[PDB]
Amino acid sequence: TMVKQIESKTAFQKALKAAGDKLVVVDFSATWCGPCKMIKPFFHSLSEKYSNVIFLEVDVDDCQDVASECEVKCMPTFQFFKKGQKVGEFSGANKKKLEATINKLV
Ligand SMILES: *SCCS(=O)(=O)O
Ligand SMILES: *SCCS(=O)(=O)O
Numbered sequence: 001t002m003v004k005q006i007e008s009k010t011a012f013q014k015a016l017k018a019a020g021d022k023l024v025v026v027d028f029s030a031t032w033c034g035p036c037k038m039i040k041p042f043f044h045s046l047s048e049k050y051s052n053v054i055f056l057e058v059d060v061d062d063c064q065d066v067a068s069e070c071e072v073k074c075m076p077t078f079q080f081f082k083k084g085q086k087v088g089e090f091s092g093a094n095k096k097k098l099e100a101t102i103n104k105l106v
Contacts, residue, residue, distance in 0.1 A: 002047035003027075003055045009066055015056055016081055023106050024054040024081035028072045030061050035093035036076045042095055046102065053102060080105050 006012045006026075016024055027043055029036035047055035060067040060075060070079065073091070078098060080088040088105055090097060 001044055003044055003057050005057045005059070007059075007062065009063070012056075012058070012066065015054065016084055019054045019081075021083070022052060022054050023087075023102070024056060025102060026056045026058060026079045026081070028058050028060055028067060028070065028077040028079065029075050030059060032061075033075050039076060039093040039095060039098070043098070046099065050102060050106075052106060 004015065006015060027036075027040075029040070043055070047053075058066060060072065070077075075091075076093050077091040078089065078101070079086060080101060082105070088101060090101060
C-alpha cells in the first residue's frame, strides 16, 4: 500500500533522489511471473511496516531497457539503495531473506 510503481526511467532517478538517507528497496518483477505473484502481498505488507524504508516497483516488460542496465537475469530481483548507490542485492521469491536484508541494511 506504501509501494510506488516506477513507470519511467525518470521516476526511478527521482525516487532515489527524494528518498534522502532512507533505504530504497526495488522489486524488479513482471505480471506473468509465477514466484513474483507469490511474494507480492508480502512485499506490500512490509511497506506499511517500515516507515523508514522506501518501497519501489519496476515492471521489466515495460522497462526492458532499465532491467538490462541493472543486470537483472531473473525475477523477482530485489535491489537495495542508500543515497544514490547500490548497497546490496539478491534474487528469488524468498520471504525470510527479503526481511533480513531490510533489517540489516536499514
Ligand atoms: S521503465 C519504463 C520505460 S518507458 O515506458 O518509458 O519506455
Ligand atoms: S540499476 C541502475 C542502472 S544505471 O542507471 O546506474 O546504469
